[PDB]
Enzyme design. Sequence first.
Site, PDB file in Angstrom:
ATOM      1  CE  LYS A  49      -1.359 -30.518  71.071  1.00 38.60           C
ATOM      2  NZ  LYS A  49      -0.906 -30.526  72.505  1.00 38.60           N
ATOM      3  CG  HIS A  99      -6.133 -28.612  72.010  1.00 37.93           C
ATOM      4  ND1 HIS A  99      -5.951 -28.118  73.286  1.00 37.93           N
ATOM      5  CD2 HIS A  99      -7.272 -28.042  71.548  1.00 37.93           C
ATOM      6  CE1 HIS A  99      -6.932 -27.283  73.577  1.00 37.93           C
ATOM      7  NE2 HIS A  99      -7.751 -27.220  72.538  1.00 37.93           N
ATOM      8  NE  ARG A 144      -2.995 -34.954  75.047  1.00 41.07           N
ATOM      9  CZ  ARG A 144      -3.126 -33.767  75.632  1.00 41.07           C
ATOM     10  NH1 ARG A 144      -3.142 -33.681  76.958  1.00 41.07           N
ATOM     11  NH2 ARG A 144      -3.246 -32.669  74.900  1.00 41.07           N
ATOM     12  CE1 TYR A 193      -1.175 -24.928  71.433  1.00 44.89           C
ATOM     13  CE2 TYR A 193      -1.966 -25.545  73.609  1.00 44.89           C
ATOM     14  CZ  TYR A 193      -1.667 -25.881  72.306  1.00 44.89           C
ATOM     15  OH  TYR A 193      -1.864 -27.178  71.875  1.00 44.89           O
ATOM     16  CG  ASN A 251       0.113 -33.518  74.370  1.00 47.20           C
ATOM     17  OD1 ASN A 251      -0.145 -32.940  73.314  1.00 47.20           O
ATOM     18  ND2 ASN A 251       0.026 -32.920  75.558  1.00 47.20           N
ATOM     19  NE  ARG A 306      -9.471 -31.261  77.076  1.00 49.24           N
ATOM     20  CZ  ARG A 306      -8.317 -30.870  77.605  1.00 49.24           C
ATOM     21  NH1 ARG A 306      -7.858 -31.453  78.705  1.00 49.24           N
ATOM     22  NH2 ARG A 306      -7.629 -29.887  77.039  1.00 49.24           N
ATOM     23  CD  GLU A 360      -9.389 -24.408  72.622  1.00 47.15           C
ATOM     24  OE1 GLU A 360      -9.842 -25.498  72.210  1.00 47.15           O
ATOM     25  OE2 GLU A 360      -8.783 -24.292  73.708  1.00 47.15           O
ATOM     26  CE1 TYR A 398       2.784 -24.319  78.863  1.00 44.35           C
ATOM     27  CE2 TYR A 398       3.629 -24.717  81.063  1.00 44.35           C
ATOM     28  CZ  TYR A 398       2.569 -24.478  80.216  1.00 44.35           C
ATOM     29  OH  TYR A 398       1.288 -24.394  80.713  1.00 44.35           O
TER      30      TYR A 398
HETATM   31  N1  GDP Z   1       4.812 -28.216  82.121  1.00 47.02           N
HETATM   32  C1  GDP Z   1       5.066 -28.203  80.790  1.00 47.02           C
HETATM   33  N2  GDP Z   1       4.037 -27.971  79.934  1.00 47.02           N
HETATM   34  C2  GDP Z   1       4.238 -27.947  78.595  1.00 47.02           C
HETATM   35  C3  GDP Z   1       5.593 -28.179  78.079  1.00 47.02           C
HETATM   36  N3  GDP Z   1       5.512 -28.102  76.738  1.00 47.02           N
HETATM   37  C4  GDP Z   1       4.218 -27.847  76.420  1.00 47.02           C
HETATM   38  N4  GDP Z   1       3.463 -27.750  77.529  1.00 47.02           N
HETATM   39  C5  GDP Z   1       2.007 -27.478  77.571  1.00 47.02           C
HETATM   40  O1  GDP Z   1       1.258 -28.689  77.512  1.00 47.02           O
HETATM   41  C6  GDP Z   1       0.016 -28.449  76.849  1.00 47.02           C
HETATM   42  C7  GDP Z   1      -0.257 -29.544  75.831  1.00 47.02           C
HETATM   43  O2  GDP Z   1      -1.583 -30.018  76.029  1.00 47.02           O
HETATM   44  P1  GDP Z   1      -2.854 -29.170  75.522  1.00 47.02           P
HETATM   45  O3  GDP Z   1      -3.019 -29.258  74.025  1.00 47.02           O
HETATM   46  O4  GDP Z   1      -2.777 -27.728  75.952  1.00 47.02           O
HETATM   47  O5  GDP Z   1      -4.041 -29.908  76.321  1.00 47.02           O
HETATM   48  P2  GDP Z   1      -3.907 -30.092  77.917  1.00 47.02           P
HETATM   49  O6  GDP Z   1      -2.953 -31.219  78.230  1.00 47.02           O
HETATM   50  O7  GDP Z   1      -5.260 -30.409  78.514  1.00 47.02           O
HETATM   51  O8  GDP Z   1      -3.407 -28.802  78.527  1.00 47.02           O
HETATM   52  C8  GDP Z   1       0.145 -27.114  76.132  1.00 47.02           C
HETATM   53  O9  GDP Z   1      -0.722 -26.142  76.725  1.00 47.02           O
HETATM   54  C9  GDP Z   1       1.582 -26.694  76.340  1.00 47.02           C
HETATM   55  O10 GDP Z   1       1.669 -25.280  76.534  1.00 47.02           O
HETATM   56  C10 GDP Z   1       6.664 -28.426  79.074  1.00 47.02           C
HETATM   57  O11 GDP Z   1       7.843 -28.631  78.712  1.00 47.02           O
HETATM   58  N5  GDP Z   1       6.329 -28.422  80.372  1.00 47.02           N
HETATM   59 MG    MG Z   2      -6.116 -30.530  74.938  1.00 50.57          MG
END
Ligand code: GDP
Ligand code: MG
Lengths: 132, 133, 132, 133, 132, 132
Positions: free
Chosen positions: E10, E113, E100, E51, E110, E87, E124, E59
């Site tokens: 990211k 992904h 992370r 997403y 974070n 993962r 994906e 969000y």
């Molecule tokens: N609750 C929350 N979720 C968020 C926020 N910003 C981003 N996210 C979500 O956090 C996720 C980031 O992690 P991701 O790459 O999806 O892997 P994941 O942690 O397993 O879901 C994304 O799906 C975002 O849509 C926020 O401010 N609040």
């Molecule tokens: Mg992820």
Amino acid sequence: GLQRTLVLIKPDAFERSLVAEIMGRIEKKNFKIVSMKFWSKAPRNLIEQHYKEHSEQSYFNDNCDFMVSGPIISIVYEGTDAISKIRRLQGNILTPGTIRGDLANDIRENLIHASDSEDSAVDEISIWFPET
Amino acid sequence: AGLQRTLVLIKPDAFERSLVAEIMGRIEKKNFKIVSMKFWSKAPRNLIEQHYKEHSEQSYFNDNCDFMVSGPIISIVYEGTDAISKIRRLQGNILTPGTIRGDLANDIRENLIHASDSEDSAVDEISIWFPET
Amino acid sequence: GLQRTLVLIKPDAFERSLVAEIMGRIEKKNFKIVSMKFWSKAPRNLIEQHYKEHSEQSYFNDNCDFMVSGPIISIVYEGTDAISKIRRLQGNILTPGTIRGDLANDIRENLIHASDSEDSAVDEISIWFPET
Amino acid sequence: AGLQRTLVLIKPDAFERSLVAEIMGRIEKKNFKIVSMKFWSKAPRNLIEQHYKEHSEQSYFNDNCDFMVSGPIISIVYEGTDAISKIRRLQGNILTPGTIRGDLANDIRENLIHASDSEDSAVDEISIWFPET
Amino acid sequence: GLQRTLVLIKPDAFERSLVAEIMGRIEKKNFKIVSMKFWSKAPRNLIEQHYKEHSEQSYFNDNCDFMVSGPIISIVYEGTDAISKIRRLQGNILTPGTIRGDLANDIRENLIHASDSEDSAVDEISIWFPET
Amino acid sequence: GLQRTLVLIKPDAFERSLVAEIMGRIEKKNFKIVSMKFWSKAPRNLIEQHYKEHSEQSYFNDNCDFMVSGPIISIVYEGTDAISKIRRLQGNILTPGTIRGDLANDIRENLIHASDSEDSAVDEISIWFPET
Ligand SMILES: Nc1nc2c(ncn2[C@@H]2O[C@H](COP(=O)(O)OP(=O)(O)O)[C@@H](O)[C@H]2O)c(=O)[nH]1
Ligand SMILES: [Mg+2]
Ligand SMILES: Nc1nc2c(ncn2[C@@H]2O[C@H](COP(=O)(O)OP(=O)(O)O)[C@@H](O)[C@H]2O)c(=O)[nH]1
Ligand SMILES: Nc1nc2c(ncn2[C@@H]2O[C@H](COP(=O)(O)OP(=O)(O)O)[C@@H](O)[C@H]2O)c(=O)[nH]1
Ligand SMILES: Nc1nc2c(ncn2[C@@H]2O[C@H](COP(=O)(O)OP(=O)(O)O)[C@@H](O)[C@H]2O)c(=O)[nH]1
Ligand SMILES: Nc1nc2c(ncn2[C@@H]2O[C@H](COP(=O)(O)OP(=O)(O)O)[C@@H](O)[C@H]2O)c(=O)[nH]1
Ligand SMILES: Nc1nc2c(ncn2[C@@H]2O[C@H](COP(=O)(O)OP(=O)(O)O)[C@@H](O)[C@H]2O)c(=O)[nH]1
Ligand SMILES: [Mg+2]
Ligand SMILES: [Mg+2]
Ligand SMILES: [Mg+2]
Ligand SMILES: [Mg+2]
Ligand SMILES: [Mg+2]
């Protein structure tokens, strides 16, 4: 034999999260911390005293501005031949293996200062740690 | 083609400072392979004196021997292209950052590592530490 | 208090140039080398003694073959609670933070062996270092 | 939103073993920032006793105080999202690899780092080491 | 159990100069790059598809903004049990030893992904590498 | 003096799991990725163009073979004095502190290529990134 020298860790190190990397390189070569201060923002007068040899140069004010643009750490290091050895560790942006050579690529934003001689080390330690 | 073997000693200060793996790792990362290796809780004074025979008339001879028996050492034979000069360059000196001594040592006696400095030296030193040719 | 345990560094560590990485992890947790041997190829009888508890398993011969497929290092480590602590450091391929968790991804090619108990440590040290 | 400050001590064993930067680096890499920092060649016994006041009736109290004055310490205030619990997790314990204590320590007294364990603890400890609020 | 999974590095990783650190952790676990693309700024549509399941959350829009705020790298990794293992390597901001866990401290920023299942990996991969 | 230069990460880096280590050294010196391609096996024609100047040397064909013996990554890096600085970072197998100095020990299998001049950088970028 044993010497003490003054190191500043510059605001760019903080910005780039390289503080521990830099301190680690010096720690790994067996130099010890004798004194240390953290400045969220160094008083400008201290910075101007530190760089007083450059006061006539065109870059003087701009360099001072950089040096108050973020935190700095001032450290007195002690070890054998500390002045020259830490100066060598600092190196320059042209020399891989050194702090500046591996991590910096700018004339001004170059991460670290180390005293360049016995006289300047004495002077710089007194600027940052007048207590001793 | 240009394959050689060289002798490395990891010195007692490396054990005292917990830098054994750090030193071996730098050699490993340069693609040199371990051919033989011995751990000595304390090296025999006799081996140390033979190793540093060329220094026997120097003022620092006895003190260096004392240091070298003050703690464990590891003797290693490394193999690879141009191993002798390459591992010597890796060893470096306390004035040259990027090298083992340059990054990690700050004393001309307690300097962490020995590596053979020539083909003649390597043959002799390997014989001393690994007589089972 | 103080314990000693037996570690093998496996042929896959050599093949993947992870020998120092593995030894470094143990060294960094403050354990000391008490004995060490390098085997360009371990005698098969030693390997079979080492894994004698597995002699009835389907994977016994294949695992032994792997273990003689390249060099190994046998090390006796000493430190507080060494047996359990180094076992924890080894971990498994599912647990990030551990040697196996960070560096291995196979049931057999898993880089390191560490004694799993007081009795096996005693036994394994005698297999690899009968002199003591 | 969830910004907090917490107090970290780098203990004398970290200096003895040259792990100061290693410890600070793990916290830096997790994106926490130094707000205040002091180097103590030797911490006053009085500060150490206040810091560990909650342990004053424990059998290990005096010995732990002795250890904590046996060499230098660095006291640091760190700031960041959820800093208190996050830096506590980074600290870990000698049983949990991946953490500072888990990777680097093997003793329940000489365990390299202290980090505040709660909001109440952090307020109190920051007051002790950085009274200039 | 050979598998392929999709990883995004990211914009915060680029901002914080952690790209190699992240890729290195996956490399050291013996997973192999099968394909890789660099996006100076990812097309918003790709992000919105990626997403899609979150399109109803509060969000969504802000997260999409973040994901186009700087470069990203999309990578297909291959290896035994790759989906689950990578993962686990990603982990979470509460678990030291993971990407992370060691490097991130935010719910949105974070760093990485990784696909969370067989179905999502297939999906994906089709998004970022349609030629597949 | 902002510049762009072309880097190849060679098949030996993949074989030895040094891809991230190499990219990390360039990242830590504050150079930025402008574009990047992954080749599971580079088209031989691209390799032949890249090393066109060597087409008369005895090693040409064998070097080309090596360069298609595994994956490569082609990267355009951007930064102040990038051509010279990344060239210095690459170094040679005789100079510790550099990529080749620390990690390589062969005249052919030397992990990385970086453009050696303004003209060659222009040329090499056009080869691997014609869209430019
Ligand atoms: N609750 C929350 N979720 C968020 C926020 N910003 C981003 N996210 C979500 O956090 C996720 C980031 O992690 P991701 O790459 O999806 O892997 P994941 O942690 O397993 O879901 C994304 O799906 C975002 O849509 C926020 O401010 N609040
Ligand atoms: Mg992820
Ligand atoms: N030529 C030039 N030099 C600069 C400029 N800004 C900062 N510097 C350098 O920054 C340095 C500050 O001194 P110091 O912290 O000791 O770094 P060092 O002198 O390079 O070791 C001076 O040597 C200056 O040459 C600039 O605009 N032009
Ligand atoms: N000049 C000097 N050298 C010393 C002293 N004590 C130890 N040494 C050196 O320590 C070195 C041990 O490292 P060695 O394995 O021989 O590699 P080398 O240092 O490059 O020759 C020897 O070269 C000795 O010259 C001393 O008091 N003075
Ligand atoms: N199920 C299974 N296990 C294997 C196979 N090959 C090796 N192993 C494992 O390899 C291990 C060898 O023991 P050790 O070196 O102590 O590794 P550890 O037992 O996992 O800590 C055994 O536990 C076996 O379970 C196999 O083909 N199948
Ligand atoms: N059980 C026990 N604990 C000790 C002893 N000596 C020191 N300690 C512990 O060392 C710890 C110092 O680390 P601290 O900064 O308080 O963090 P903590 O260990 O997680 O509580 C204290 O918790 C003490 O309980 C001892 O002899 N026995
Ligand atoms: N002399 C010699 N050169 C070789 C051999 N194999 C490959 N090379 C050349 O070494 C070079 C590898 O480094 P390169 O990427 O070009 O950067 P360079 O070292 O600055 O020229 C290539 O140009 C190859 O053609 C060999 O066996 N002998
Ligand atoms: Mg300077
Ligand atoms: Mg030598
Ligand atoms: Mg085991
Ligand atoms: Mg604590
Ligand atoms: Mg080149």
